[PDB]
């Protein structure tokens, strides 16, 4: 698909069998989801955003279906104002910026 | 052009006669530039994200050139770690997300 930017580029994703709404975010190196339980072990990690650093739980090799396209990568879970799909997963589905 | 996401999508922009490097961010509602003394009247405001909120100065109708493409809009100046071009300016240069 081709998505214009008049509205936040929010799309439905499937993860852990659940359906969620997430922002396609070219300015995020990582994928960060609001607190939820994902199967498997996690490791404490810290990441920075515009307002500072937060602590997150890191889950590796998690399959995520973004608008029908499959990706399997690292997903961070922590206090984010919105679920964001970052460049680590956007590259797997072949997302590019065009103008 | 077409920009892949293997690396952060950084491009050269021009504002206030200055040439800069800024991240094209589909996950930013606004444009936020690192601390700089632009002549002009501004209004204070707060924007947030991962980590919380930061105080920024809002400047309106500022001419901004993004990789040869002209745009004009609101620019926020504040203690941001990176210069960020948000949707308010990306929509003006016809930028789309494609996959």
């Amino acid at each position: 698909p081709q998505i214009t930017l008049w509205q936040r580029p929010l799309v439905t994703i499937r993860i852990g069998g659940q359906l969620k709404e997430a922002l396609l975010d070219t300015g995020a190196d990582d994928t960060v989801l609001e607190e939820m339980n994902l199967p498997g072990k996690w490791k404490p990690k810290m990441i920075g955003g515009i307002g500072g650093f937060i602590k997150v739980r890191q889950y590796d090799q998690i399959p995520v279906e973004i608008a029908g396209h499959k990706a399997i990568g690292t997903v961070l879970v922590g206090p984010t104002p919105v679920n964001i799909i970052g460049r680590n997963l956007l590259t797997q589905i072949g997302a590019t910026l065009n103008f | 052009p077409q920009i892949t996401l293997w690396q952060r999508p950084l491009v050269t922009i021009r504002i206030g006669g200055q040439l800069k490097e800024a991240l094209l961010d589909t996950g930013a509602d606004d444009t936020v530039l690192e601390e700089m003394n632009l002549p002009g009247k501004w209004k204070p405001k707060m924007i947030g994200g991962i980590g919380g909120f930061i105080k920024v100065r809002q400047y309106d109708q500022i001419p901004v050139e993004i990789a040869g493409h002209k745009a004009i809009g609101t620019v926020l100046v504040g203690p941001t770690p990176v210069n960020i071009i948000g949707r308010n300016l990306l929509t003006q240069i016809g930028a789309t997300l494609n996959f």
Partner: peptide, 5 residues
């Protein structure tokens, strides 16, 4: 990682 809301 920048949302900017």
């Amino acid at each position: 990682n920048x949302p900017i809301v």
